[PDB]
Amino acid sequence: IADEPVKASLLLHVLVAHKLKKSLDSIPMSKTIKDLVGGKSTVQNEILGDLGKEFGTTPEKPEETPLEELAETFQDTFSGALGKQSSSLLSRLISSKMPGGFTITVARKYLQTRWGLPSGRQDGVLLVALSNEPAARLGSEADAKAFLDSMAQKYASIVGVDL
């Protein structure tokens, strides 16, 4: 289908949600990183370190800027690329929670064949998969395919795509 590059507002919202260990819905974009974190500066400074490694250059004081103004300031320079911090997050999601033999490229082939989603959508489906990483490894291949299918519909809901 249509290949639109992944939005920075979704990427940023996933990285914060993954770090705070909360569901993507539990973090409102209106709240600031300093408000969200609840006084735990070490968590807040690890978030600012993840954002600095992901995008590169960051605004003056990103902990007091709400996640909207921070998302659009990143988007002005954001080339659309996966990132380095997201490379490691997705590498360790696939290595630690997917069945033995089921690598990242086999999931990239499956979602392409099943949904007709290009590499720009498949990035987004893998990012929304990261924000709600399952506690235990999915032993069966069909449970990993049912998770990836459920994540596609959740990504499709968030963006507004009809399959």
Ligand X SMILES: *OP(=O)(O)OCC(C)(C)[C@@H](O)C(=O)NCCC(=O)NCCSC(=O)/C=C/C
How far apart are CB 71 and ligand X at their closest, in Å? 23
How far apart are CB 120 and ligand X at their closest, in Å? 37
Residue of closest CB approach to ligand X: 41
C-alpha span between 27 and 17 (Å, rounded): 7
The strand pairing partners of 66, in sequence order, are 32
Does the footprint of ligand X cover residue 41 (CB under 6 A)?
Answer: yes
- Residue selected from 42, 57, 79, 96 as contacting ligand X according to rule CB under 6 A: 42
Site string for ligand X, 12-31 (x = CB under 6 A): --------------------
Does the footprint of ligand X cover residue 87 (CB under 6 A)?
Answer: no
Question: What is the number of other CB atoms lying within 10 angstroms of the CB of residue 132?
Answer: 17
Question: What is the number of other CB atoms lying within 10 angstroms of the CB of residue 55?
Answer: 22
Closer residue to ligand X in complex, CB, 41/91:
41
Residues 64/32, Cβ–Cβ less than 8 Å: yes
Q: Within 102-141, which residues bind ligand X (CB under 6 A)?
A: none
Does the footprint of ligand X cover residue 150 (CB under 6 A)?
Answer: no
How far apart are CB 72 and ligand X at their closest, in Å? 27
Q: Within 60-79, which residues bind ligand X (CB under 6 A)?
A: none
Closer residue to ligand X in complex, CB, 42/79:
42
DSSP 35-82: HHHTS-HHHHHHHHHHHHHHTSS--S-TTTSBHHHHHHHHHTT-----
* 146 phi/psi in degrees, rounded to 5: -75, -40
How far apart are CB 88 and ligand X at their closest, in Å? 23
C-alpha span between 67 and 81 (Å, rounded): 20
Q: Under the rule (CB under 6 A), what is the footprint of ligand X?
A: 41-42
